[PDB]
Design an enzyme around this catalytic site. Structure first.
Site, short mmCIF file in Angstrom:
data_model
loop_
_atom_site.label_atom_id
_atom_site.label_comp_id
_atom_site.label_asym_id
_atom_site.label_seq_id
_atom_site.Cartn_x
_atom_site.Cartn_y
_atom_site.Cartn_z
N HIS A 317 0.81 -1.22 0.00
CA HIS A 317 0.00 0.00 0.00
C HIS A 317 0.85 1.27 0.00
CE1 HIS A 317 -3.39 2.49 0.31
NE2 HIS A 317 -4.12 1.79 1.16
N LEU A 393 -29.30 10.35 -5.08
CA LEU A 393 -28.61 9.76 -3.93
C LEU A 393 -27.42 8.93 -4.39
CD1 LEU A 393 -31.66 8.56 -1.82
CD2 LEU A 393 -30.64 10.83 -1.97
N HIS A 394 -26.24 9.54 -4.34
CA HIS A 394 -25.01 8.87 -4.75
C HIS A 394 -24.87 7.54 -4.02
CE1 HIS A 394 -21.13 9.16 -6.84
NE2 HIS A 394 -20.72 8.34 -5.89
N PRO A 395 -24.57 6.46 -4.75
CA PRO A 395 -24.40 5.12 -4.18
C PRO A 395 -23.38 5.06 -3.05
CG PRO A 395 -24.58 5.00 -6.54
CD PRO A 395 -24.31 6.44 -6.20
#
Length: 591
Positions: A317, A393-395
């Site tokens: 990462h 409504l954004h997921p």
């Protein structure tokens, strides 16, 4: 258009106004404080704004004047390279390759054949990148930073006594030569071979000969010294083991560098994780766990191959975030789809050199460290619990709020939550923290559990929660978040030998999540059918990740078994119910 042509045009990572950042911080601690604690924190913040903070902020502005990205180096060191815990298990992220959804279902005996194609497509991606033919990412007509793509190939971390380092050997054609070999780990042993022949990339049949050769050679022979297992250790222990290994034979360094410079590491595992479109949580578990003897945890990109023809990626990462891995994994998924998971080209196999084995010089001490390394990784990994399911409504906001409600219902309290926000609008921009546990979110959660709450009330409060989260995500991705900003202020002080401001010692600073204390570590992993995951940020916490398709939500949740309070499966079940209730509320409110 070339892959990196907009890099010199990207705007600088901004430094938000101190006042705005402190206002957002104060607002963020409300869900976890009573009147007294809040008043204390407010006075601490006010003094900070008037004194030390104003001065540290000015110094931060001066840093930004000389750096297109004032945070980049600091973030890499403080969030990754300086951390001492074993990074392979606790920091690396993993992603299963979604090919078992179609042409490559789990099936014994298909490891080598599918493997030859997995390498072929991955290498074609590399060629595209080296020629800068990879499409530039854009939001509308605004280009996004593409620097993380340089970290996909020929990139590897090197352990240090107090600070690790990242070696990036990748180069585009315009810049110069790039390594052209890959490294294969099998049965505690390591091999390498060039992917080019007479100027062109070798084919699946040719790649199949290389893998078959390696597989057959090692199968009926004892496991090798397993030097790779050392990469899964506590960072300082690995740094010392690496120095010792090198002292045993200079050539050992040469071997290490060969692994370091390889386009990527390909690992052959003999295990077979249950992987069906319905249940595949086991792929995540074996990806984060697995057999240390054939995993190079320090590699930015370690492609994993299981015995049942299933695949996955394990990535460091440190040099980049999950989206680069998602992109290549998706690219490959499309190639497999277009080809029906088959190679329909020439079956010819040219006379190319056989893979060369990297034989490390080892002694009794190194073998004891290797033994110790394998054991600690296996034990630690065995405490990992992974729950993965699909909802159909954004997921993103919808999912974040549902998670808030689910945790609230399952644990009876608001869960301080970390949600990754990308800042790729800016030069070398990586991430910012979005604090999902807002006052609005909690008010809504209470209304949902409130028997006297009217449908209209619940809908109204939910919408207010959405609006807050949306604005928050927008500001954060636009460089107006406050978490990195406050970190920068802290680092300005430390780097000059100045004491840590009282604001950071305040109980509410860490209770609200600051200092890496979020009970919910989350992030959207895109809309490309690929799912990623990492272990929780804290022992009594959860890791919750997901990706969105036009017809479903795919989630992956992690928790530690040694923590009785948490249960990944139960949280996922709870969020599904949450999705349900929210859907019902919206449809009903529809009317």
């Amino acid at each position: 258009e070339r892959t990196f042509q907009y890099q010199d045009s990207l705007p600088s990572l901004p430094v938000p106004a101190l006042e705005e950042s402190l206002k957002k911080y104060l607002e963020s601690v409300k869900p976890f404080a009573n009147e007294d604690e809040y008043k204390k924190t407010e006075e601490i913040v006010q003094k900070f704004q008037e004194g030390a903070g104003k001065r540290l902020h000015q110094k931060l502005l001066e840093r930004a004047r000389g750096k297109r990205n004032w945070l980049e180096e600091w973030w890499l060191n403080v969030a990754y390279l300086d951390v001492r815990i074993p990074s392979q298990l606790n920091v690396n992220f993993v992603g299963p390759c979604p090919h078992f959804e179609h042409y490559w279902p789990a099936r014994e005996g298909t490891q080598l054949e599918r493997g030859s194609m997995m390498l072929w497509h991955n290498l074609n991606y590399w060629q595209l990148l080296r020629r800068e033919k990879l499409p530039v990412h854009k939001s509308g007509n605004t280009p996004l930073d593409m620097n993380q793509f340089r970290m996909l190939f020929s990139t590897c971390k090197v352990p240090g006594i107090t600070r690790d380092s990242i070696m990036n050997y990748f180069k585009t054609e315009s810049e110069g030569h790039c390594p052209t070999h890959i490294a294969v780990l099998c049965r505690g042993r390591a091999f390498v071979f060039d992917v080019l022949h007479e100027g062109c990339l070798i084919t699946p049949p040719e790649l199949l000969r290389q893998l078959t050769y390696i597989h057959k050679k090692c199968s009926n022979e004892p496991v090798g010294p397993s030097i790779a297992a050392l990469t899964s250790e506590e960072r300082t222990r690995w740094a010392k083991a690496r120095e010792y290994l090198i002292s045993l034979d200079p050539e050992n360094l040469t071997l290490l560098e060969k692994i370091q410079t390889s386009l990527f590491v390909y690992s052959i595992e003999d295990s077979s994780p249950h992987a069906t479109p319905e249940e595949y949580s086991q792929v995540f578990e074996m990806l984060l766990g697995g057999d240390p003897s054939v995993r190079w945890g320090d590699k930015s990109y370690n492609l994993i191959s299981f015995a049942n023809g299933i695949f996955g990626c394990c990535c460091d990462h440190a040099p980049y975030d999950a989206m680069v891995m998602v992109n290549i994994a998706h690219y490959v998924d499309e190639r497999v789809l277009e080809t029906e998971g088959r190679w329909k080209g020439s079956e010819k196999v040219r006379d190319i050199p056989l893979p060369e084995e990297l034989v490390f010089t080892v002694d009794e001490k190194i073998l004891n460290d290797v033994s110790q390394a394998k054991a600690q990784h296996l034990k630690a990994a065995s405490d990992l619990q992974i729950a993965a399911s699909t909802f159909t409504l954004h997921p993103d906001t919808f999912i974040q709020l549902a998670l808030q409600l689910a945790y609230y219902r399952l644990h009876g309290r608001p869960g301080c939550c970390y949600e990754t926000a990308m800042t790729r609008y800016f030069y070398h921009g990586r991430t910012e923290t979005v604090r999902s546990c807002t006052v609005e979110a909690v008010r809504w959660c209470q209304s949902m559990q409130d028997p006297s709450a009217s449908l209209l009330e619940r809908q109204q409060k939910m919408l207010e929660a959405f609006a807050k989260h949306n604005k928050m995500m927008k500001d954060c991705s636009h460089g107006k978040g406050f978490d990195r900003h406050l970190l920068g202020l802290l680092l300005i002080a430390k780097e000059e030998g100045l004491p840590v401001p009282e604001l950071f010692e305040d109980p509410l600073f860490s209770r609200s999540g600051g200092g890496g204390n979020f009970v919910l570590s989350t992030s959207l992993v895109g809309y490309l059918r690929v799912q990623g995951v990492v272990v929780p940020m804290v022992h009594n916490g959860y890791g919750f990740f997901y990706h969105i398709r036009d017809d479903r939500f795919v989630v992956a949740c992690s928790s530690w078994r040694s923590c009785p309070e948490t249960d990944a499966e139960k949280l996922v079940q709870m969020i599904f119910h949450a999705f349900h209730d929210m859907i019902q509320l919206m449809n009903t409110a529809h009317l």
